[PDB]
Structure formats: structure tokens, C-alpha cells
Design a binder for this molecule. Structure first.
Ligand code: ATP
Ligand code: ATP
Ligand code: MG
Ligand code: MG
Lengths: 52, 412, 403
């Protein structure tokens, strides 16, 4: 078994549009010159799969 | 059973068949024998025999060999027991055929005599085409009888040979060998004349026929080759040309019968020219021009994806080099790098709603591609604590990623 | 003078710099615009304009037209969307009948047309044609008429490809209606594709009463004018004096080219012109360009063979990243440090790519060769074979898979 071997039967999604966030939520974030940061309010597991 | 938006793991990668064909050919090229009795010629080494088991006047062998100047692999055809009597036989022919560069002719690089095999031998150095098989091996090898060559395949053959004859005849030469055994399939439907220079050398100064006469005979041989393929009969077995022509007339279009007949017909008062023959097959030629370009596009598609796999690979290496170093102190966990760690978690440490880990290769490739490109798309990176979140564009991330790496380069 | 086409160098379809070209086209495909005003359509998103200059021009279609790179949401692929602005489709039969004809068409010299649909999502009535996307394409107009003599060979190459398009189009009882320089795109070196095929068929669906054969005769004249424009450097609209342009061509180029162009322009012969007859007259050129296409095939295959292992290398690095630092494991961490966190005697970081490749290759293979993994503080050390290491990583991965 080569190390490069990955399981064949794993499915990915490719069509989805980019993440759109609720404008209310973006207000929560505190702008910095490189981006936005703030407190996570949403009920999503860390790095969870998002269905756009 | 798969939705158009969903991909299996390997769909992101090169299809298995193509991968395997390339790997097999890579293997055939690299094959060596560490201690054969076979000699090294001054510029050629690692000779490897290719003969599984006619056209020339001598017993012949074919070896894969590696040139010592450039490290490339070539095919060396050896004629056994050939004695140098006139150097012009070797030199003039080599000078002429070294000019020839054509997709449908196996290129000749060199012609030379050698004593290194323990006899006098004549060697022709050719492009090497791994895992090639001759048309004879492919169409006439029994068991069961071999299947009917489709007409489309035959027009493909005719066009590729016409291409060869156009270049050969324009340089005031003749393709002298047009046997199935001396034409090779280097790929699906891709044929190449493989024995071109040889007849010129062996018959040098003994032949009394003109260039134009040899050129006329090329057309007859061309016809007999097609006739052999159409009816499944070896050229040696072609005793009755008209009977073969009628068989062809029953199995194939009138257009094909007409093409073959023009090639065989020596009775007209007309000098046959490759120009006139091409004029008669313009439609077929246009079709094959199209298919060649389409195949180019297909190869380019896969090439573009594998070059991008390479870029991704180099990027993943840069990532591993940057993240989680033993280290200023904590450099890896602070500043720019901290977001990069969070990015890595976003790309490679995904989880389902159920908390189950997600191993979708599609997400990983796309993210690394977008990072490399510096896309103007925003993503949400969450702290390990899960209290804090960051919103960044891939463009911003690339700036950070490049800076982190350049710092390491500076440290040198 | 068969010499101009007989002369053409073997690299005629080969890019000057394949590495840079691929990289540029890769970047162009992923480009998006942070704050375009552009809408998302039901099956389309990430629209990106390709029109260099935002000017309303309606020359071939009679309406302002825009081109967007967009990404289809049904399949994850990128397409080129031609939008006719302010166009209201009045007959739905137009799309169905025209598409029935053109969906069959697959040709190396024609940009494939996939779909035609109306939309109000741009804030007006708009008609959208979805095409294959060809990154960093430029029109013959942009390329040859944007302020030197086009070489005869380039011209014969164009002629052979356009003849290729016309063979397929006419055989399917259709007509290329748009043969303007602005509607032929260079998708690669000396490689042209008709980019507007379905559109006139739809826009004029009820109105045009000319026969199929009639529209085809006009293809030849338009074809002739394209060649004449390129030969003499004057745009087709300015081509007021055809005989005067022909003599110019006759002075700068071979008699064969003048002859071919003349046949294309001649409506006086009383003969119905056929693409079959035209191909017959340029058979020699076609054979040359067939050879050149095949040589490029060999060039591409060469590079493909050299790049074939990249996927394998990439997936290996990915598993490493997938397994480590999620939150035996210690040896694994040390291996990564051994491969990627090398340091010089001076303590300075070593970035030798060779070390990384050799190590990942040996890991991949599970070689028996033993290595020494030490914490930087020398207190703890391990002596392991790559075979043992691969066993460890794979066990970790299989744990992850179980889910
Ligand atoms: N330029 C080349 N590159 C790679 N392989 C080649 C090349 N030329 C010939 N070969 C291979 O060498 C093998 C032997 O070819 P050769 O023509 O000598 O044998 P043959 O045709 O079987 O002999 P006979 O004519 O007696 O039947 C073939 O399988 C062929 O594919
Ligand atoms: N299938 C395609 N894939 C990628 N780019 C394309 C495609 N078709 C056209 N383009 C590009 O879109 C740009 C705009 O083309 P288009 O023909 O709409 O405008 P134009 O020719 O510059 O002006 P006009 O609309 O007046 O003719 C061109 O640079 C062209 O290369
Ligand atoms: Mg042999
Ligand atoms: Mg436009």
C-alpha cells in the first residue's frame, strides 16, 4: 500500500458559491488593516462543512 | 450514481488508464541490464534488446540504448555482418535523412559501423518509442483471426503515411520500406515509418532506379499495404491483386477502393505525385487535422492539472516548513504564522456537523490553488479555542504566507 | 510557390514558454472581482468581466454584448458567458431548435456552445449564451489590428483551421454566420477558434429567409474578407475596394494565397462554392498543419510524462497535513521536523527541496533504510526505518478514515 493512496469512495462538492455571511454578523467583527476579527456567535462546529 | 456537482477522490487526479500507460512507458525506457555481455559503444551504453522474435538484406537486432552525451534513450537498429566498403554509403545517406523531421517518421540521428559486437555491424540510431508495436504484430498476429480494420482507422493510416511521403518526396528521397513490419504504432492510431534510412544505405550504388522511380514504387507499396490491412492478408500472401481489390470493394467505401486503385495503378501514362494524392484525400486530411488538435487539447488538459498538482505540492512543502517550528521564540504561533496555522486547520482539519472528520480531497486542492492565486475571496478561520474568529481573503493570506517564507529565506 | 507552407517551422503550435503560459492561464481561471455589481444567476456565480474596455459595441449581433468568465454551480466548471444586453427573446422555439443543431458540434476550431437562456437578473432583459472557457484568449482583431506584416504561414494556418470549422458546420447543414476578426479568438499560439457561433442563428431566427446554402456562400465571402483584412492590415469594414486590396495582397504574398482568397471572394463564377472543393485546393497546406499538430502532440506528451508523479507527491504531503496537529504521535512530529525543519550548523534554516523530496519518496516507498530522529535537545532519540514510519502514519490515517 503506497502512502500516496487515498480512499477512492470519498465524495467532494465542487459547484458551491463562496461563503456569504449575514450582514448583521459582519457588524459584530472588529476591522483591522488585514481583515476582520470578533467573537464566534454561530452554532457551527469548528471548521465544519458549510452548505452554500 | 454521482451528482454532477460531486466528485470521487480520484476524479481530481489523472485518470488511471493514462497514468498506467505513462508509467509503463516510463518503465520500458528506464529498463536496464546491469551485466549483460552486450558491449558499450563509445557514445552508447546500457543496450537492451527489444526483439520478441525481413525488409533488409541482413539479420537485424534492435536495442534500446542511452546516449552518453545527452542521457536520452534512442533505438539502435543493427544490421549483422555489414561491411564498410564505401564511406559515402553511410555519410551521404546520413546527411540527407538527418534533415528529415516529421511526426509520421521515426527520426534518424546517426548511421555508423562498429566492430564492437564481435563482427562488422551497421547501426542506425533512432528516436526511441517505448512499448511500440508494429502494424504486423498488431493486425496479423494469431488462436483466432484478427478483427476487421475499421475504415476510419485506415484513413487515419493513409493520412499519416501521406504526411510522411510528402516530406520524404519533397527532399528528393523515397520511403523505400512500407511493410506492416516496418511501420510502428507508437500510440493508439498513431503510426510512424521506422526503417527509413536503411534501404538507402544497403542498396547504395547497386540500385539503378531513379529517385522518381523509387517514388513511384512507394505508391505501389503504399497501396499493397492498405490492401493487406483491408482484407487481413499478409503482403507476402498477396498473390492476386485484383481479387484483393474486389474484397476491399465489398467491405469498404468506393472512395477507399478508388484511393487504393490509384496507388496500385502503374498502367496509366501519368507520373504519380504525392501532391496529386493529397489533393484526392483533402477531406480526410482535414478531419484528422481536427482530431489531432482535439487530442492536443485533451493532453493539455491533463498536463495543466498535473503541473498544478506540482505547484500545490511545492506549496504544501512551504507550509510544512513554516508551521510548528521549534523556533525569535514562538514565531510559528505568533503574528502572520498564527493565521496560517488556522488556515491549515480550515483546509485539512475539516469536520462534519456530526464531528466526524471530513477527508474531501476536493476542498484541500481548491484551497491551496486559491491561496497560490491570491484570490479575492473571503474565508472564516476560527481560533483553536473557538472563541475567536478571523475573516480573511486568500489574497491577504498569500501576502502573509509569502512574508513568512521570505523571512526563513533571509535567515538563510 | 508552395514554399511558404512547406517552410513553416515545426514549432508552429508550440508555446514559447509553456511554464509561464500555464501559470498565467491557471491564475486567470481562478480570478474573481471583490465588488462587481454583477448578479448570481440560478446556476452561475463568480461572474468576472473579460471585456478589456467597457464600451458599447454591437457590430456583429446588433446589440451590446459582454463576456463573463463564470463558474457553473451544477458541475464545478468555468464557462464563458456571452450576454446580449437589452435583448428580449420573443420565440422560445428559437433556443430549442438552434441548440438542437449546435449541441452536436464538437470541433477544435469552434468554441463549443452549451446553453442558451434568458435572464432578468442583470436588471434588464438579457440573452445569455454559455461557451467553453478559454483563459487569456484574445481576438484576431485585438492581436493583429491593435496600434507588422502577418507572415504567409500564419495565414495558411488560420485558413486551415477556419476550413476545419467550416467543414463541420456545413456538413451539419449549418452556417458560421459570424466570421469577423473580433469573433475569432486566439486561444493559444497560432491557434484560432470561432467564438460566436450560435448567436446569429437565434437572434435572426424568424427573420432571416435565406437558405442554408445561401448563408454558406456568404461564409466564403466573409472568409475571403478576413484573409484580405489580415494580409493588408485594413479592417473588414474599411474594405471598400476589394480589387485594390487583392492587388496589394498579390504584391505581398504568394500567387497561391491570392488565388485562394480570390476563389473565396468570387460570387461571379456561377458555381455553387463548396467547402469540399476549397479543401481540395489547400490539401498540401492541410497536410503540413496536420504534421505540425502531431508534433505539438508529441511535445505535450513529453511534458506530461515528466509531470506524472506530481499527484502522488501532493497526496502524500496532504496526509501529513491531515494527520498532524489536530488536537506514536511524537515520532511522527519528529519526522516532520527532520524533513522540513532542517537547520544549518549555524542554526540557520535549511530549505533544500532535494532533502524533502528524497525523504517523502523514501517514506512513500516504505524503504528499509534507517534514520535517526532526535529532539533538538538531544535527550530523546529514535532509530527507525522508513518502513516503520509509513506503518505508523498509515495507522494514524486509517484511524481518521474510520468515521
Ligand atoms: N524506433 C523504435 N522505437 C521503439 N521500438 C522500435 C523502434 N523501431 C522498432 N521497434 C520495435 O522493435 C521490435 C522489432 O521490430 P522489427 O521490425 O525488427 O521486427 P519484426 O517486424 O517482427 O521482424 P519481421 O519483419 O521479421 O517480422 C518491434 O516490436 C518494434 O516495435
Ligand atoms: N470562449 C471564450 N473564452 C475566453 N475568453 C473569451 C471567449 N470568447 C471571447 N473571449 C474574450 O472576451 C473578450 C471580449 O470579446 P468580445 O468579442 O465580446 O469583445 P470585443 O471583440 O473586444 O469587442 P466587440 O464586442 O465589439 O467585438 C475578448 O478578449 C475575447 O478574447
Ligand atoms: Mg527485428
Ligand atoms: Mg464585447
Amino acid at each position: 500500500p503506497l502512502f500516496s493512496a487515498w480512499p477512492a469512495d470519498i465524495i467532494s462538492d465542487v459547484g458551491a458559491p463562496p461563503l456569504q455571511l449575514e450582514p448583521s454578523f459582519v457588524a459584530t467583527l472588529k476591522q483591522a488593516e488585514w481583515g476582520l476579527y470578533g467573537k464566534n456567535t454561530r452554532n457551527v462546529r469548528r471548521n465544519q462543512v458549510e452548505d452554500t | 450514481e454521482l451528482q454532477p456537482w460531486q466528485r470521487a477522490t480520484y476524479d481530481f487526479f489523472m485518470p488511471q488508464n493514462l497514468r498506467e500507460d505513462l508509467q509503463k512507458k516510463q518503465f520500458a525506457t528506464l529498463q536496464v541490464i546491469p551485466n549483460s555481455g552486450l558491449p558499450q559503444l563509445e557514445h552508447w551504453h546500457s543496450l537492451v534488446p527489444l526483439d520478441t522474435s525481413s525488409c533488409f538484406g541482413y539479420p537485424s537486432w534492435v536495442y534500446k540504448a542511452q546516449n552518453s552525451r545527452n542521457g536520452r534513450h534512442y533505438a539502435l537498429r543493427r544490421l549483422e555482418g555489414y561491411r564498410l566498403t564505401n564511406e559515402k554509403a553511410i555519410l551521404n545517406v546520413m546527411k540527407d535523412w538527418k534533415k528529415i523531421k516529421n511526426a509520421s517518421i521515426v527520426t534518424i540521428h546517426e548511421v555508423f559501423t562498429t566492430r564492437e559486437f564481435g563482427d562488422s555491424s551497421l547501426i542506425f540510431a533512432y528516436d526511441f518509442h517505448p512499448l511500440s508495436k508494429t502494424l504486423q504484430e498488431h493486425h496479423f498476429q494469431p488462436y483466432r483471426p484478427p478483427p476487421a480494420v475499421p475504415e476510419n482507422t485506415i484513413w487515419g493510416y493513409i493520412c499519416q503515411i501521406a504526411n510522411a511521403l510528402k516530406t520524404i518526396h519533397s527532399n528528393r528521397l523515397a520511403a523505400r520500406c512500407l511493410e506492416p513490419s516496418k511501420i510502428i504504432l507508437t500510440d493508439i492510431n498513431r503510426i510512424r515509418l521506422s526503417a527509413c534510412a536503411i534501404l538507402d544505405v544497403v542498396q547504395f550504388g547497386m540500385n539503378s532506379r531513379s529517385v522518381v522511380e523509387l517514388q513511384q514504387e512507394d505508391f505501389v507499396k503504399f497501396g499493397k499495404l492498405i490492401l493487406s490491412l483491408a482484407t487481413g492478408t499478409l503482403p507476402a500472401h498477396l498473390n492476386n491483386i485484383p481479387a484483393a481489390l474486389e474484397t476491399l470493394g465489398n467491405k469498404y467505401s468506393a472512395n477507399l477502393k478508388s484511393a487504393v486503385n490509384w496507388l496500385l495503378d502503374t498502367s496509366s501514362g501519368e507520373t504519380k505525385t504525392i501532391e496529386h494524392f493529397m489533393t484526392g484525400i483533402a477531406s480526410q486530411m482535414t478531419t484528422f487535422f481536427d482530431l489531432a488538435l482535439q487530442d492536443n487539447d485533451e493532453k493539455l488538459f491533463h498536463l495543466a492539472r498535473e503541473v498544478e498538482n506540482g505547484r500545490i505540492a511545492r506549496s504544501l512543502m512551504k507550509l510544512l516548513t513554516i508551521l510548528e517550528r521549534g523556533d525569535v521564540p514562538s514565531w510559528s504561533e505568533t503574528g502572520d504564522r498564527y493565521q496560517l496555522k488556522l488556515f491549515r486547520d480550515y483546509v485539512f482539519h475539516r469536520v462534519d456537523a456530526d464531528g466526524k472528520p471530513n477527508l474531501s480531497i476536493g476542498h484541500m486542492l481548491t484551497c491551496m490553488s486559491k491561496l497560490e492565486a491570491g484570490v479575492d475571496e473571503n474565508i472564516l478561520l476560527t481560533s483553536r479555542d473557538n472563541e475567536t474568529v478571523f475573516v480573511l481573503s486568500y489574497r491577504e493570506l498569500r501576502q502573509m504566507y509569502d512574508r513568512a517564507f521570505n523571512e526563513l529565506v533571509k535567515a538563510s
